[PDB]
RNA sequence: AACUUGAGUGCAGAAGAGGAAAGUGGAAUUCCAUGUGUAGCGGUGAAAUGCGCAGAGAUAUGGAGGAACACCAGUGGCGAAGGCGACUUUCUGGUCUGUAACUGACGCUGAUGUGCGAAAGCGUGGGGAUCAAACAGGAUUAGAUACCCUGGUAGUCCACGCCGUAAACGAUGAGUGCUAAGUGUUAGGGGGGCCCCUUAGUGCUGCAGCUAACGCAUUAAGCACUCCGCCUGGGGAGUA
């Protein structure tokens, strides 16, 4: 299935955009696989760096 | 055994009382495939029976069947270095088959004068919760009251 | 008290410790399977931890406890026989979360054996 | 003397756990201090040693310290190899794609040499949570200086040096070109979300061809050319 990435075009995933984030992370925060959210390689890694990022400045739970 | 089930070979009626229980129990006073005595030694005990306790002979009998007859037994599991004994319910053909069995064997293993008075004997004391044939059904709840913790490892 | 005591159960490969606390992380009572009589291979048996939960249960209600939150910490045989274990007692079990602590690595995991 | 395709440089892009330094986090383990709390905890196939009743285990809060970074995470990526996974910043290496702006063979391999090189090990100085060689017990066995359990020292961590060995393996040297296909995945490019073409990696089947066979097969173990290293029955012996 479709990235959500690549289909509307974002290019800089932002980790200030929490809410965006919230649809990858699950009931725990946990990253959730690529498998199941169906983005890119490409977009699974930046996307990463974000959720790690919001995770450090306290947007983003650690366990929930 | 592996392939299915083995049917049962079943008794007649007893010539005197009408009851399969009965004959049964002459199957196992017979020593030696002698049926005549131990036809004799039930006679010589139903009506005996009927003189120490007061009621039917076969009324008395009925009583005390229902306490020699066990309700859960202790079939044996295995894990390894220890063997489970997993309490089982008895089914009730098996029921009939141990009664019967534990009146005979803890009727021969006291003594008096006669096979004639101890069957008699212990007829009435099973009535009344007394005996070795009521003391080892209450041995074999036990068993099976101690090891509920194994209840869940009936195969 | 009079309601909200939060129960603790321990259910491991060995005996299932129930602990039943206040809402605050304070004890009122506690009964594992060992201090039932139970003998190991008896120890982590469901049976074994029905009467270990129900035991710690009729403890609390001598408390006035009316409302008991399950917080489960172990991958342990008896634990689904432990909570209704505590609803056959009536103890209106609102939440069952598990805490099984999960590390984000940062330890050695002790060797297994052979 | 001349030329660009080889090799490099220029320009426009791409991805990456490539390396070094310093910081910042969350979960967990251990220990410590308290509050609650009562007779067990723990472990096995069964035990017991062992920790407890001088209040253990559990539970709640707080503190100290060390180490490693769940989910992401994959026949995924990077590196010459060994190896490299928390996040941020600073230095810094390599690779790929496209273009064709420049040089016009400036290339390959490479003895000796010179560096890097997993773990374990050694020296110096720190640190020491967890797991632990060895050591102590407790068991099993006929015996058990072993597998099982209970603890437990060096080490495991850091900074400098030393060591220079691994089934350091794709058990497959480096470079170049040619030789059926099918279907994936990673990072780009160009055309008409889809299709086609294409470059470089990484996979699985599979032709010719090769092999003793297993099997390899455009990431050869096929067909060719250049250079280096290595072998000539098994022990004795990687021993003098």
Same mark, same amino acid.
């Given at each position: 299935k479709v990235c959500y990435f690549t289909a509307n075009g974002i290019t800089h995933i932002d980790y200030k955009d929490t809410e965006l984030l919230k649809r990858f992370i699950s009931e725990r925060g946990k990253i959730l696989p690529r498998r199941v959210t169906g983005t890119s390689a490409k977009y699974q890694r930046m996307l990463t760096t974000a959720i790690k990022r919001s995770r450090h400045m306290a947007l983003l739970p650690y366990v929930k | 055994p592996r392939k299915g089930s083995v049917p049962?070979?079943?008794?007649?009626?007893?010539?005197?009382?009408?009851?399969?229980?009965?004959?049964?129990?002459?199957? %196992?006073?017979?020593?030696?495939? %002698?049926?005549?005595?131990?036809?004799?030694?039930?006679?010589?005990?139903?009506?005996?029976?009927? /003189?120490?306790? #007061?009621?039917?002979?076969?009324?008395?009998?009925?009583?005390?069947?229902?306490?020699? !007859?066990?309700?859960?037994?202790? %079939?044996?599991?295995?894990? #390894?270095?220890?063997?489970? /004994?997993?309490?089982?319910?008895?089914?009730?053909?098996?029921?009939?088959?141990? #009664?019967?069995?534990?009146?005979?064997?803890?009727?021969?293993?006291?003594?008096?004068?006669? !096979?004639?008075?101890?069957?008699?004997?212990?007829?009435?004391?099973?009535?009344?919760?007394?005996? #070795?044939?009521?003391?080892?059904?209450?041995?074999?709840? %036990? !068993?099976?009251?101690?090891?509920?913790?194994?209840?869940?490892?009936?195969? | 008290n009079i309601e909200n005591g939060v129960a603790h159960i321990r259910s491991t490969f060995n005996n299932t410790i129930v602990t039943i606390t206040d809402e605050f992380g304070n004890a009122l009572s506690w009964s594992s399977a060992g201090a039932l009589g139970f003998k190991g291979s008896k120890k982590s048996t469901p049976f074994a931890a029905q009467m270990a939960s129900e035991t710690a249960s009729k403890s609390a209600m001598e408390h006035g406890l009316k409302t008991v939150e399950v917080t489960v910490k172990g991958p342990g045989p008896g634990r689904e026989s432990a909570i209704r274990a505590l609803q056959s007692a009536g103890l209106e079990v609102t939440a069952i979360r598990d805490v099984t602590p999960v590390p984000h690595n940062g330890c050695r995991p002790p060797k297994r054996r052979r």
């Open positions: - | 049962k070979r079943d008794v007649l009626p007893d010539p005197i009382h009408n009851s399969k229980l009965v004959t049964k129990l002459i199957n %196992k006073i017979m020593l030696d495939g %002698k049926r005549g005595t131990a036809q004799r030694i039930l006679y010589s005990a139903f009506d005996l029976v009927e /003189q120490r306790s #007061g009621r039917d002979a076969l009324e008395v009998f009925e009583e005390a069947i229902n306490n020699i !007859m066990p309700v859960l037994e202790v %079939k044996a599991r295995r894990v #390894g270095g220890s063997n489970y /004994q997993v309490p089982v319910e008895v089914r009730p053909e098996r029921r009939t088959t141990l #009664g019967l069995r534990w009146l005979v064997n803890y009727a021969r293993l006291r003594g008096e004068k006669t !096979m004639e008075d101890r069957l008699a004997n212990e007829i009435l004391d099973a009535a009344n919760n007394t005996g #070795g044939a009521v003391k080892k059904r209450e041995d074999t709840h %036990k !068993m099976a009251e101690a090891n509920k913790a194994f209840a869940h490892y009936r195969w | -």
